[PDB]
Amino acid sequence: SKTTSNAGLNLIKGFEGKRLNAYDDGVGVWTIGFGTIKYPNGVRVKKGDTCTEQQAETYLKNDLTKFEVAINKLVKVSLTQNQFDALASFTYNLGETNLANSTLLKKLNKGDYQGAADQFLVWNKAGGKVMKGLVRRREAERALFLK
Amino acid sequence: SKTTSNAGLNLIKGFEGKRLNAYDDGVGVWTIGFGTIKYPNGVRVKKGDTCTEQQAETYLKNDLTKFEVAINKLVKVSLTQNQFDALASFTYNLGETNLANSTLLKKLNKGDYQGAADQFLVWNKAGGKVMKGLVRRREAERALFLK
């Protein structure tokens, strides 16, 4: 069973940004590193927390584990490491339920890799508006999937 | 018995957006207007459909009826219109079963309005992922509920 490799980690790190001081993510949930809100020991991130780059990467790798488990359970065809990494970014962003219900996964499990790759681009909306950042993200994920 | 007023309608329009051309939501469900997937005559939205803003408003008001019915059946205490509208947004987003089983409804039906208001905030997850947009929705619903 696969885990997220450096291609997927770099993708996600680019999207989350690097923040070594805890920050309000905009809705009052304190966050640090590359999108971490809870340390692997269960302690919640709080205002005033600081971390190192290595700690942030470890925390990201931990945050990914549940979504990696979901991908390994849900996908029933072979994946290149690039394809797994693209799905890890997609699923980290959108959650396991969106992956489980997606047309992407339906087509993927039929062996239709090209159709699945094109489904990444459908998920470009937040609040019904197409977001340029989500377009760029889905395009990067599709590009890695097809690499 | 109550129906959703302009306040709840604006809350829901906020996070559904407005799209007068039908679009795929990523799970193969074509969607139009303010999150409508089935017209009031039971006909499913399909690719190529278009509607006017007025039609979209009518369709959204129709979509809300099942959730309004659920709230009026499940809630056993008085509600201001603001509180009803907050619950309409919450239940539109999360569904009748989640409302029925919620600590939110349990506290509300004991007459514990402040406890219920605070329970809005725990419903900020999708597919194992805390979502900033969901936190925003829940905080807006709580604020309207408390107004």
Numbering used by the authors:
A (entry chain B), B (entry chain A): 22 to 168
Quote what the paper states about this structure.
Despite their lower amino acid sequence similarity, PHAb8, PHAb10, and PHAb11 superimposed well with T4 lysozyme, especially in their Glu-Asp-Thr catalytic triad regions, suggesting that PHAb8, PHAb10, and PHAb11 may be phage-originated. All these observations together indicated that PHAb8, PHAb10, and PHAb11 were highly evolutionarily related to T4 lysozyme and might share similar catalytic mechanisms of action.
Results showed that PHAb8 was a monomer, while PHAb10 and PHAb11 formed an asymmetric dimer. Specifically, the two asymmetric units of PHAb10 formed an antiparallel dimer with a rotation angle of 177.2° along the rotation axis and a distance of 10.5 Å between them. Further, PHAb10 dimer adopted a circularly permuted architecture, in which the N-terminus of one chain and the C-terminus of another chain formed a cavity, which might be the binding site of the peptidoglycan substrate. Structure-based homology analysis revealed that PHAb10 and PHAb11 probably belonged to the T4 lysozyme family and possessed the conserved Glu-Asp-Thr catalytic triad shared by traditional phage lysins and bacterial autolysins, namely Glu17, Asp26, and Thr32 of PHAb10, and Glu52, Asp61, and Thr67 of PHAb11. We carefully examined the topology of the PHAb10 dimer and found that it was supported by seven pairs of intermolecular H-bonds, with three pairs supporting the head, each two pairs in midbody and tail of the PHAb10 dimer. Specifically, in the top view of chain A, Arg20 and Gly27 were involved in intermolecular H-bond interactions, supporting the head region, Gly128 and Gly129-mediated interaction contributed to the stability of midbody, while Lys133 and Arg137 were involved in intermolecular H-bond forces anchoring the tails of the PHAb10 dimer. While the variants R20IG27D, which has mutations in the head-supporting site, and G27DR137I, which has mutations in both the head and tail supporting sites, lost dimerization ability. As a result, both variants lost most of their bactericidal activity after treatment at 100°C for 1 hr, which could be further explained by the failure to recover their native forms after heat treatment. At temperatures above its transition point (i.e. >53.7°C), dimerized PHAb10 dissociated into monomers without precipitation. During the cooling process, monomeric PHAb10 refolded to a stable dimer via the intermolecular interactions between the two monomers, i.e., three pairs of intermolecular bonds at the head, two in the midbody, and two at the tail of the PHAb10 dimer.
